[PDB]
Design a protein around this ligand. Structure first.
Ligand SMILES: Cc1cc2nc3c(=O)[nH]c(=O)nc-3n(C[C@H](O)[C@H](O)[C@H](O)COP(=O)(O)OP(=O)(O)OC[C@H]3O[C@@H](n4cnc5c(N)ncnc54)[C@H](O)[C@@H]3O)c2cc1C
Ligand SMILES: Nc1ccn([C@@H]2O[C@H](COP(=O)(O)OP(=O)(O)OC[C@H]3Oc4nc5nc(N)nc(O)c5nc4C(S)=C3S)[C@@H](O)[C@H]2O)c(=O)n1
Ligand SMILES: Nc1ccn([C@@H]2O[C@H](COP(=O)(O)OP(=O)(O)OC[C@H]3Oc4nc5nc(N)nc(O)c5nc4C(S)=C3S)[C@@H](O)[C@H]2O)c(=O)n1
Ligand code: FES
Ligand code: FES
Ligand SMILES: [Mo]
Ligand SMILES: [Mo]
Lengths: 161, 274, 701, 701
């Protein structure tokens, strides 16, 4: 029965893109701020109510909105962020396809959108247009109008078979 | 955006969690956190402690136990959506967005009791039951009695939902209709249907309404209209009409919503039948 | 050549790998966090207890109520106090300790009420009416004399909120002599001018880092930016300000919000003769930076009312009025969407009243050839409207036989505003080339277009041209990115600087060869065939004391260049009153297209904003002046599910701009066209007159 | 005018308030810390186990032993492995886990041994001898024929260590396309060229932030900088490297370390006729960047041996030889101190052997008028040595009657090396002026001198001229700060750019006034008296598409300009053998003095380094090739207690440089003059011949 009061911090471990980090947090701190504070600034805060998805990372195989998880709650988790898709500078096929199909403008939804896409393509190898759209409906983008994002995801699905 | 300060408890086992909650009236347990954390962030709640129940993995499970499915409270939307429970799986599928369903749990949705939630429409229709655990032991209650009012579950300091029970509804037909402005939103209107055919007679029918009252209700009048009858265009139209009798909605408009109950009941009957 | 090719974005690599640096990704040693306390009332006298870590408007603008309110607050969401803490979490704890004393005053929400001056938005205004001019052109009397019929109604273009996915934000640091200010802004150089003006000194560097979009919401300096900057002079620590998204909704990016009381004069054959009536625009509270932005936009709305039509006279009485709400600002199109929406709705209302075909009425009334000066003095410079409409009829005919309802609209638009723009190009001894633009892209991909332009001029591979922007220290100056000006005005500056560089490389090459031909960076003696390489020219320029760093300023002498097009949608409405868009076609003429991939990308982004205004979005206040929609659940920007199943974009080059690029702007065109396209479509399905937006579900059942 | 005035430093405000930003004050998100494992042996074969967080030379320069050793290490302190960790504390924990396998080879420490090629410093050298040329001039045969007497000895100028108070350090970040590299370096633009050359691509931005001094130690790119940069390409996180001071002592800033075997030919009346012998310079290990730096310095030493004297012939056999120690680099004066030290010691040795007065012998042998070309081809360009010496005799006479021993020396010096230097000046629309230099000041205060120059040219207040440097993105290019070139070469570039700006402001002013007078930034019609202000000219330049951003490159056509002077000290030695310096006088001719306060500040800083070499400092190795002095306790740089009680600095302007500033360099002059001044003084007190430094206590008892 580990008990941490308001005015303490607790040491946690997070395994992020294959590497272990160790930090001390108050209980109320959100995982999204801790990830950023550890240098993962590609994880973005677009809202305060869990709608936008700009903060999406893979936690233990699951796409999650890291703004809606306490950092202490993530203790011991494995987390992938967009910074961990490319191997030795070769782009992951989802990244390549976003570039080829012009699926980003300001780029701010892009890490989260790519992470949801990664997760989605691991659920459903060959998704319909409709399943793609459903499958990214937690990720808002204000710039692109989505059409190119759907195109990139289909192109990536085919690259991935 | 930023929660208030609070203490935190990581208990070794259930017994410990229960005791801490007993003794600390205003500590809140944390499951998928997708209703608790958003409320911390807006500072609409200020508990002294958050108690973490998430790592009790024997609280996550789908078990078919005779003609009951037993569902661990920590089972997520995503897993329920993937497990072929008639009506309930499809209903879980509709909840929020993929990220949300990856974390949200059935125990936390029903302990929270938002009057526009998806599950209560299915759970009222199913005559679901809620196993409630205490250091004192277990109490099983009917979903209907558990849902005392919007945001008001039948839970005392010291207790947790540990299990949801539903009949297996084999051979039943079903549909969850969710009206929404955008993918990802809570229901503007939700209609959950279960029915079973003996020949072309409606042998059993159950209709649940969410987002149109303070708690989920049965569409009693739509049920009366269909039960035991042979299906045709006329009775469907009539049942869809009578479903409006159970809707007491709040201003879309209250009037628009009541009208939508009829539209979604009709979509539900026709979808389940097809 | 690279110009005209769908070249993929040089910007993408950093951003798809999460190696951008937006304002909140930046930190300095000892950075403190700043949050603002905001008015919970529409109109109130205020007293705020100044306390440790608690600053008030008196610390910022003593004797004034703007940028920060000191005695009197004029809108829910107005900053009334500033707290400073060790970090964001503690800053928001500290917000709850601030002690504000309110005296609730009377307030006005409706600009039609407000213009009666019965209740003043602020104590010290002579008038809630900020601007009031009667716009007249052609011969309105003759129009209404010759008419067989007149039609009247009131059309609303409701308030919306820009809602870029990254909010405003800023980081300010004064070292004792110099202020360095990072901001999620639309232009580093313009923000610098704003801060120089407000603070009274010139030693200010501004950095626009990556910006997560803006859509007009980040042109102005906001009250928080002025305050942060002024605080940084005082505190001598770096100070980070990032609003919550609730804050952003309540305080920033409100746009549109204009009403037209109209009467149209027509002949029974669908000839539109003339228009008159009253335009009422809601400026919200008197914040000078916003008022000035939006009031210029009011004028854009009136002046574009004649659209692409051969109107004979009009008479429009224009009001821009304050009310007790968030001050109104540019949003994507900045007045032009409202004006095109007004004329394109009126055109359909008439078509529907006279049983004329919605496409035929437009072919009937369309201007023939360009140039043409509209009734309110806008010169439409080049192209051919009729001919573009003939091209577009083929899609209208196809859509008319599919299942659903068709809507069309035709637009014309103003872009590429002056007064000037800058480009610097520089070559290092080893040969490296860097191009700097004085514009400030924030998603639109102009840097790729700039690299295509400069590489064509220099005849070099495009990877040779690094493109930079957004630091007041790496270029002489700049204007900014807004008014769909960047590829046109900023690209013309790029073309001039690259040309100056090429001319210079030529003469150094000539000097080295004794003479007075350039290919791919090398210079060759046109018989005797002696050649000096690019790299040899560059090293010799340095040895000869000759600089290869050059800056061009392209002064804009021409008036705004005008693209135009026709857009079409096919929709369905179901038994719940939900609208589904099946297909959308855009046919645009934007002059020379520098990059069709990026141009279409702009068309589509705008189209979906314009559709969302028609079908989803709206900023509404309860009668206590509280914004009802303050998060992404209640302010419903579209997900991927709510988009047209397909959007096909086509362009025709019938009219080039007079600028060296030949291009006109498209950044805003999509948002201008889509709203009435979509509303016309839905109206065909319903079929009652649609007078306001968003179209609600219950209005369609 | 500001030029010639002791204007106080514009640089001081940030630094006295602790708001600088030196390299270790900079952080980026996720920055990792880098430390190097270093050879514990002078010469060894190595195997290093590559492991998690442990990189080796193979990761940096496979197939080579430089910059990082892979198979064979050649000096104690050489980097042999690189560790990466979360922070500095953990990095140094990780150092202790690295697994190195050494095969000790034979090594050579003494360059005189080494030049016999009996033991090679590295396996793969043809020869330890890096450079070997016989220097001949005039008629040495005639000199030794005509001599009444010859004197012989061996003089040592021992190894010292630059010891700037801030060590090297660097921060490297590659975003996928571009490397940004911050470094405690002497020039951002030169470091960029070094990294471009090593890494094979051009997309590198270098930032020189505040630098805590260098004294020649930060000209070259060090092995750690190449490695950090190459690692940053691979790792994709920012990587901070900061050595401990033990590391710094062992690996960087070693300079001097030259031996002269001499024989001098004199007439009995103290005529110095000629010199011959052998110069041996210790390059330490073969690191190409350092070898190349120091070998140019060897040449400076030989070529300055004739000093200010009318020598008739000389014949010097020059060696630059490797040994198994830290490679040798420029230290303040960069070869010139050793050469002047050699001739000024020889002059006193002769004076003492012939009972001639130390001042009289110099007046006897001094060149009469300038220009004059010395025996080894150095043209001393302007001034009057004899006359400066007459001025200085008055202080010698005064000092000769005070209590203690007097030493004098006279120096001449080479400064203001090419090949070019850059300046950019730019004016923003609101009027703000920024001047950028391509030099890289790191304590010397050139930016104040630049601001004085530009303000005189523009006729504006000095506070109007912000001066920036040290970012490869804010200026076309640059050379750097070293060879006492910055105020002269960099200031001439500043003068050209400011003049171009003024000329441009004139013609825009003329255009605005119809004509073809400038005062204080304003232009006036020389009857009719119509006037346009500075700010109006600037706004109109932008409206007219005319840029006010200009870059000048000053190509250096002249050979190095040569200051000279005479310095004098009065010392006492006590019964413990401790030396106390009572007074020191410097008389210098450095051409036009831009800023006497800053010039004297340079004279004094150099003087104290030169005195410390004579009296305190020395880098010595035990016979295992371990440096004996690796901290500020054992390497005794002076405290405030060890300085002359007073240093009076005077200048005379008898000879200006040919450059537009008229100035010559003084950055190095103090260190050149003080060493033999002080040694000559001590020698007068002892009175045995002093042949080596530092003078130890036990040698004086
Ligand atoms: C963007 C977003 C969209 C959403 N959309 C929908 C939607 O469309 N439809 C819908 O129905 N829901 C929606 N939700 C809510 C979501 O389903 C939540 O997961 C759910 O409401 C709460 O479940 P949880 O496990 O996350 O509970 P938590 O947030 O962990 O807990 C919620 C409440 O239950 C208590 N609690 C948790 N578990 C137990 C237990 N076992 N016993 C007793 N008390 C317990 C907590 O103390 C708390 O008071 C959405 C949420 C978000 C953030
Ligand atoms: N004839 C043309 C016209 C445009 N283009 C391409 O389309 C884009 C440039 O459009 P331009 O029309 O010059 O508009 P701007 O770059 O000046 O963008 C400003 C405009 O951009 C719009 N789109 C936005 N897109 C993003 N991602 N984020 C915002 O905040 C945006 N805000 C809006 C708003 S509001 C405005 S005013 C560039 O890729 C340009 O190369 C082209 O190739 N050929
Ligand atoms: N005729 C002159 C000559 C010099 N000055 C002033 O004296 C200083 C410039 O000296 P300059 O002779 O141009 O030498 P640099 O600026 O190029 O400095 C380089 C020189 O600077 C020296 N002094 C140093 N001082 C500091 N603080 N830190 C170092 O690392 C230093 N390193 C050394 C070394 S080694 C070198 S090579 C400037 O303030 C200049 O304005 C002047 O006013 N008039
Ligand atoms: S920041 Fe918007 S969902 Fe996490
Ligand atoms: S690319 Fe700007 S929000 Fe998606
Ligand atoms: Mo805009
Ligand atoms: Mo130097």
């Amino acid at each position: 029965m580990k008990i941490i009061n308001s005015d303490q911090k607790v040491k946690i471990t997070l395994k992020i893109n294959g590497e272990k980090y160790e930090t001390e947090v108050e209980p109320r701190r959100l995982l999204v701020h801790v990830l950023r504070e550890l240098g993962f600034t590609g994880v973005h805060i677009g809202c305060d109510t869990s709608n936008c998805g700009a903060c999406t990372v893979i936690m233990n195989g699951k796409s999650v909105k890291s703004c809606t998880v306490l950092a202490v709650e993530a203790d011991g988790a494995e987390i992938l962020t967009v910074e961990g898709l490319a191997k030795d500078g070769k782009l992951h096929p989802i990244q390549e396809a976003f570039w080829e199909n012009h699926a980003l403008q300001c780029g701010y939804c892009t890490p989260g959108m790519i992470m949801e896409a990664y997760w989605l393509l691991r659920e459903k190898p060959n998704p319909t247009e409709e399943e793609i759209r459903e499958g990214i409906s937690g990720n808002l983008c204000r710039c692109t109008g989505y059409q190119n994002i759907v195109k990139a995801i289909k192109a990536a699905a085919e690259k991935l078979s | 955006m930023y929660p208030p300060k609070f203490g935190y408890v990581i208990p070794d086992n259930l017994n410990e969690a229960l005791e801490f909650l007993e003794e600390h009236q205003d500590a809140r347990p944390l499951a998928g956190g997708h209703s608790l954390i958003p409320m911390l962030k807006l500072r609409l709640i200020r508990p002294s402690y958050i108690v973490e129940i998430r790592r009790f993995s024997n609280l996550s499970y789908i078990t078919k136990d005779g003609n009951l499915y037993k569902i661990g409270a920590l089972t997520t939307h995503y897993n329920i959506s993937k497990s072929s429970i008639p009506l309930l799986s499809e209903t879980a599928s509709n909840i929020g967005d993929p990220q949300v369903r990856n974390m949200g749990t059935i125990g936390g949705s029903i302990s929270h009791l938002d009057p526009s939630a998806d599950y209560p429409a299915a759970l009222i229709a199913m005559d679901a039951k809620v196993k409630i655990t205490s250091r004192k032991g277990d109490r099983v209650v009917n979903f209907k009695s558990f849902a005392k009012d919007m945001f008001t579950p039948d839970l005392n300091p010291g207790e947790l939902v540990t299990e949801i029970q539903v009949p297996t509804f084999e051979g039943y037909k079903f549909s969850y209709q969710k009206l929404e402005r955008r993918a990802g939103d809570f229901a503007i209107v939700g209609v959950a249907l279960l029915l079973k055919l003996s020949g072309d007679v409606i042998e059993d029918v159950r209709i649940g309404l969410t987002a149109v009252n303070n708690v989920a209700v049965r569409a009693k009048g739509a049920e009366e209209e269909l039960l035991g009858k042979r299906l045709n265009d006329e009775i469907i139209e009539k049942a869809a009409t009578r479903a409006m009798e159970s809707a007491n909605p709040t201003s879309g408009s209250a009037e628009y919503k009541k009208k939508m109950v009829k539209v979604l009941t009709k979509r539900a009957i026709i979808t389940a039948l097809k | 050549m690279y110009i005209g090719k769908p070249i993929k974005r040089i910007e993408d690599l950093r951003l798809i790998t999460g190696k951008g640096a937006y304002v909140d990704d930046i930190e300095l040693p000892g950075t403190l966090f700043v949050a603002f306390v905001r008015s919970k009332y529409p109109h109130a006298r205020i007293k705020v207890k100044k306390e440790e870590g608690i600053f008030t408007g008196e610390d910022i603008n003593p004797g004034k109520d703007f940028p920060i309110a000191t005695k009197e607050t004029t809108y829910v969401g107005q900053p009334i106090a500033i707290v400073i803490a060790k970090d964001r979490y503690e800053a928001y704890d500290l917000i709850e300790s601030v002690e504000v004393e309110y005296e609730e005053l009377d307030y006005v929400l409706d600009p039609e009420k407000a213009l009666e001056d019965k209740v003043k938005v602020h104590s010290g205004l002579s008038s809630n009416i900020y601007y009031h001019e009667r716009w007249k052109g052609g011969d309105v009397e003759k129009a209404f004399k010759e008419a067989d019929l007149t039609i009247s109604d009131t059309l609303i273009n409701q308030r919306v909120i820009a809602s870029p996915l990254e909010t405003r934000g800023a980081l300010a640091y004064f070292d004792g002599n110099k202020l360095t200010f990072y901001s999620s802004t639309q232009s580093a150089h313009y923000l610098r001018r704003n801060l120089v003006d407000f603070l009274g000194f010139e030693n200010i560097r501004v950095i626009q880092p990556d910006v997560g979009g803006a859509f007009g919401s980040k042109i102005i300096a906001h009250p928080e930016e002025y305050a942060l900057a002024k605080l940084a002079l005082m505190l001598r620590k770096p100070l980070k300000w990032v609003p919550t998204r609730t804050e952003e909704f309540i305080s920033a990016g409100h746009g549109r919000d204009k009403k037209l009381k109209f009467e149209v004069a027509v002949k029974k054959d669908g000839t539109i003769l003339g228009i008159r009536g009253t335009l009422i625009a809601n400026l919200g509270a008197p914040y000078p930076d916003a008022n000035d932005d939006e009031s210029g936009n009011v004028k854009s709305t009136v002046r574009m009312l004649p659209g692409i039509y051969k109107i004979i006279g009009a008479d429009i009485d224009a009001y821009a009025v304050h009310t007790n709400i968030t001050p109104t600002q540019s949003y994507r199109g900045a007045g032009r969407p409202e004006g095109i929406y007004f004329i394109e709705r009126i055109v359909n209302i008439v078509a529907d009243e006279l049983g004329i075909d919605q496409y035929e009425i437009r072919l009937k009334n369309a201007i023939d050839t360009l140039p043409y000066t509209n009734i309110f003095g806008v010169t439409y410079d080049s192209g051919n409207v009729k001919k573009l409409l003939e091209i577009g009829k083929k899609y209208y005919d196809e859509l008319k036989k599919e299942d659903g309802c068709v809507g069309v609209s035709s637009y014309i638009e103003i872009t590429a505003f002056g007064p000037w723009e800058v480009a610097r190009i520089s070559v290092k001894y080893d040969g490296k080339i860097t191009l700097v633009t004085g514009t400030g892209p924030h998603g639109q991909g102009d840097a790729t277009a700039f690299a295509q332009i400069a590489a064509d001029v220099l005849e070099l591979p495009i990877e040779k041209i690094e493109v930079r922007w957004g630091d007041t220290e790496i270029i002489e100056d700049g204007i900014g990115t807004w008014g769909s000006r960047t590829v046109t005005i900023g690209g013309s500056a790029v073309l001039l600087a690259s040309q100056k560089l090429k001319d210079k490389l030529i003469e150094i090459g000539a000097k080295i060869l004794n003479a007075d031909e350039y290919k791919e960076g090398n210079v060759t003696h046109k018989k005797n065939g002696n050649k000096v390489t690019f790299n040899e020219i560059v090293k010799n320029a340095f040895k000869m004391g000759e600089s290869l760093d050059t800056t061009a300023i392209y002064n804009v002498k021409q008036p705004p260049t005008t693209p135009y097009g026709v857009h079409l949608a096919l929709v369905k409405v179901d038994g719940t009153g939900k609208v589904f868009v099946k297909k959308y076609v855009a046919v645009d003429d934007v002059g020379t297209v520098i990059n069709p991939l990026l141009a279409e990308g702009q068309a589509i982004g705008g189209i979906v904003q314009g559709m969302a205004q028609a079908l989803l979005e709206g900023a509404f206040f309860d009668e206590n002046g509280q914004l009802l929609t303050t998060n992404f659940q209640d302010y419903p920007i579209p997900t991927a599910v709510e988009i047209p199943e397909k959007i096909d974009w086509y362009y025709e080059i019938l009219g080039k701009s007079p600028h060296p690029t030949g291009s006109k702007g498209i950044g805003e065109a999509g948002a201008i066209a889509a709203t009435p396209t979509i509303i016309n479509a839905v109206e065909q399905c319903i079929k009652k007159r649609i007078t306001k937006m968003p179209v609600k579900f219950e209005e369609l059942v």
